[PDB]
Design an enzyme around this catalytic site. Sequence first.
Site, mmCIF file in Angstrom:
data_model
loop_
_atom_site.group_PDB
_atom_site.id
_atom_site.type_symbol
_atom_site.label_atom_id
_atom_site.label_comp_id
_atom_site.label_asym_id
_atom_site.label_seq_id
_atom_site.Cartn_x
_atom_site.Cartn_y
_atom_site.Cartn_z
ATOM 1 N N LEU A 178 0.801 -1.234 0.000
ATOM 2 C CA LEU A 178 0.000 0.000 0.000
ATOM 3 C C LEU A 178 0.847 1.305 0.000
ATOM 4 C CD1 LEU A 178 -2.651 -1.200 2.550
ATOM 5 C CD2 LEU A 178 -3.077 -0.927 0.137
ATOM 6 N N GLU A 203 5.349 2.725 0.099
ATOM 7 C CA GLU A 203 6.787 2.664 0.461
ATOM 8 C C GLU A 203 7.237 4.077 0.811
ATOM 9 N N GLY A 204 8.414 4.197 1.439
ATOM 10 C CA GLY A 204 8.962 5.489 1.892
ATOM 11 C C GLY A 204 9.788 5.431 3.171
ATOM 12 N N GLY A 208 11.173 2.435 5.726
ATOM 13 C CA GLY A 208 9.817 1.999 6.130
ATOM 14 C C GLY A 208 8.804 1.711 5.016
ATOM 15 N N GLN A 209 7.822 0.826 5.273
ATOM 16 C CA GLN A 209 6.730 0.551 4.305
ATOM 17 C C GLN A 209 5.425 -0.034 4.916
ATOM 18 O OE1 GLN A 209 9.227 -2.558 2.458
ATOM 19 N NE2 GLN A 209 7.363 -3.745 2.027
ATOM 20 N N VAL A 210 4.357 -0.031 4.122
ATOM 21 C CA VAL A 210 3.060 -0.537 4.547
ATOM 22 C C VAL A 210 2.498 -1.499 3.510
ATOM 23 C CG1 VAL A 210 0.712 0.047 5.219
ATOM 24 C CG2 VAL A 210 2.537 1.596 5.794
ATOM 25 N N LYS A 244 2.490 -2.412 9.000
ATOM 26 C CA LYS A 244 3.602 -1.534 8.866
ATOM 27 C C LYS A 244 4.848 -2.276 9.279
ATOM 28 C CE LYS A 244 3.313 2.923 9.699
ATOM 29 N NZ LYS A 244 3.622 4.300 10.156
ATOM 30 N N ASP A 280 -2.369 16.593 12.438
ATOM 31 C CA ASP A 280 -2.462 16.582 11.000
ATOM 32 C C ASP A 280 -3.754 15.982 10.535
ATOM 33 O OD1 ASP A 280 -1.792 17.086 8.309
ATOM 34 O OD2 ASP A 280 -0.528 15.269 8.179
ATOM 35 N N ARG A 312 -7.286 13.565 3.734
ATOM 36 C CA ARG A 312 -6.252 12.562 3.377
ATOM 37 C C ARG A 312 -5.897 11.589 4.551
ATOM 38 N NH1 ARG A 312 -3.425 17.597 3.793
ATOM 39 N NH2 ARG A 312 -2.041 17.512 5.612
ATOM 40 N N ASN A 313 -6.056 12.027 5.786
ATOM 41 C CA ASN A 313 -5.790 11.247 7.004
ATOM 42 C C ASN A 313 -7.012 10.698 7.734
ATOM 43 O OD1 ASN A 313 -3.069 11.426 6.685
ATOM 44 N ND2 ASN A 313 -2.951 13.468 7.669
ATOM 45 N N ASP A 361 -3.149 7.619 11.284
ATOM 46 C CA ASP A 361 -1.871 8.235 11.662
ATOM 47 C C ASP A 361 -1.943 9.136 12.875
ATOM 48 O OD1 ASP A 361 -1.117 6.826 9.585
ATOM 49 O OD2 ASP A 361 -0.680 8.523 8.235
HETATM 50 C C1 XL5 Z 1 -7.693 -2.883 2.976
HETATM 51 C C2 XL5 Z 1 -7.929 -2.734 1.492
HETATM 52 C C3 XL5 Z 1 -7.040 -1.704 0.828
HETATM 53 O O1 XL5 Z 1 -6.218 -1.987 -0.012
HETATM 54 N N1 XL5 Z 1 -7.230 -0.452 1.271
HETATM 55 C C4 XL5 Z 1 -6.596 0.739 0.845
HETATM 56 C C5 XL5 Z 1 -6.295 1.052 -0.511
HETATM 57 C C6 XL5 Z 1 -5.754 2.285 -0.842
HETATM 58 C C7 XL5 Z 1 -5.534 3.245 0.122
HETATM 59 C C8 XL5 Z 1 -5.847 2.953 1.428
HETATM 60 F F1 XL5 Z 1 -5.623 3.882 2.383
HETATM 61 C C9 XL5 Z 1 -6.379 1.729 1.804
HETATM 62 N N2 XL5 Z 1 -6.682 1.447 3.146
HETATM 63 C C10 XL5 Z 1 -5.839 1.468 4.207
HETATM 64 N N3 XL5 Z 1 -4.550 1.784 3.981
HETATM 65 C C11 XL5 Z 1 -3.746 1.820 5.040
HETATM 66 C C12 XL5 Z 1 -4.225 1.538 6.311
HETATM 67 O O2 XL5 Z 1 -3.437 1.512 7.432
HETATM 68 C C13 XL5 Z 1 -2.241 2.305 7.453
HETATM 69 C C14 XL5 Z 1 -1.898 2.554 8.891
HETATM 70 C C15 XL5 Z 1 -0.904 1.814 9.536
HETATM 71 CL CL1 XL5 Z 1 0.004 0.611 8.678
HETATM 72 C C16 XL5 Z 1 -0.591 2.022 10.863
HETATM 73 O O3 XL5 Z 1 0.407 1.234 11.346
HETATM 74 C C17 XL5 Z 1 1.043 1.568 12.572
HETATM 75 C C18 XL5 Z 1 -1.300 2.962 11.586
HETATM 76 C C19 XL5 Z 1 -2.290 3.702 10.968
HETATM 77 O O4 XL5 Z 1 -2.962 4.633 11.686
HETATM 78 C C20 XL5 Z 1 -3.474 4.218 12.939
HETATM 79 C C21 XL5 Z 1 -2.596 3.498 9.624
HETATM 80 CL CL2 XL5 Z 1 -3.838 4.436 8.844
HETATM 81 C C22 XL5 Z 1 -5.556 1.225 6.457
HETATM 82 N N4 XL5 Z 1 -6.378 1.183 5.403
#
Ligand code: XL5
Length: 270
Positions: free
Chosen positions: A21, A23-24, A25-27, A49, A149, A153-154, A167
């Site tokens: 989902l 990169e930059g 760390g990654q998710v 993450k 923030d 977007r957040n 975040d």
């Molecule tokens: C789940 C299906 C999917 O692919 N969803 C998707 C697609 C495109 C953009 C997008 F934002 C999403 N949904 C989504 N992305 C990321 C997160 O979680 C990121 C995240 C992480 Cl890894 C944390 O780790 C410590 C903490 C937080 O904030 C608490 C976040 Cl937002 C969720 N959904």
Amino acid sequence: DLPLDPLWEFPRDRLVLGKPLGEGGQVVRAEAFGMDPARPDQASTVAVKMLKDNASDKDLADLVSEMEVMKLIGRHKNIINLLGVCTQEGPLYVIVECAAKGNLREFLRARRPPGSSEGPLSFPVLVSCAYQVARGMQYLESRKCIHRDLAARNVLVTEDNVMKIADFGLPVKWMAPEALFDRVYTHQSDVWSFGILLWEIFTLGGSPYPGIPVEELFSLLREGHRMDRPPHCPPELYGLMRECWHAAPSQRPTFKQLVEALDKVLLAVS
Ligand SMILES: *CCC(=O)Nc1cccc(F)c1Nc1ncc(OCc2c(Cl)c(OC)cc(OC)c2Cl)cn1
């Protein structure tokens, strides 16, 4: 080299990693097996993450910090919740909820009707979004978390269209005066940003201060100027934006009051 927290450790072999989902760390997206221990076979889609091999001792402390902060803040419908961690014999994974429809800016922008026509997002659905964000912030605030923030977007959106603030455990047009000039962040500064978020919602993901260049903004604010009521936005809502955009932080409403105000509007439909 970390402690094993039995409230949160999830088996690394039950977490099948998938499409990245960010990169930059990654998710990374991932299918987790039995996040619900009621039904331990059941799969669910989650986000994870982790650190990249190009990452210091410091970057690790930050990720540990965010993880630990998320445990401490605890659970709410309107934030992205911690679901588990993988800390032992392998890399740090922080596992959290995955919102199917992505962030709120893009959700609204992809749902703009063409020109003057009527779009699939009704007024209640939009006030609902705003109310949900307000509830999430009220909760984070009650757990002593200042977001810093808050913006469309957040905030992320679930399959069932639930807003989830993102975040929260770690942008000039979103920042309160005192934050911009004095580098001071408070709950009230988050309130300013919520106002901006509100305008984002009622513009279906509009770019705040449209026209105005970033360097010319700080003075427009000082003169007592604010964004205008967006088209088709009712004045009760516009008024809240504006109360959020008072220069004195104490003159801005609290998240509690924002939740009540937004609640009234939603009760006042039918
Ligand atoms: C789940 C299906 C999917 O692919 N969803 C998707 C697609 C495109 C953009 C997008 F934002 C999403 N949904 C989504 N992305 C990321 C997160 O979680 C990121 C995240 C992480 Cl890894 C944390 O780790 C410590 C903490 C937080 O904030 C608490 C976040 Cl937002 C969720 N959904």
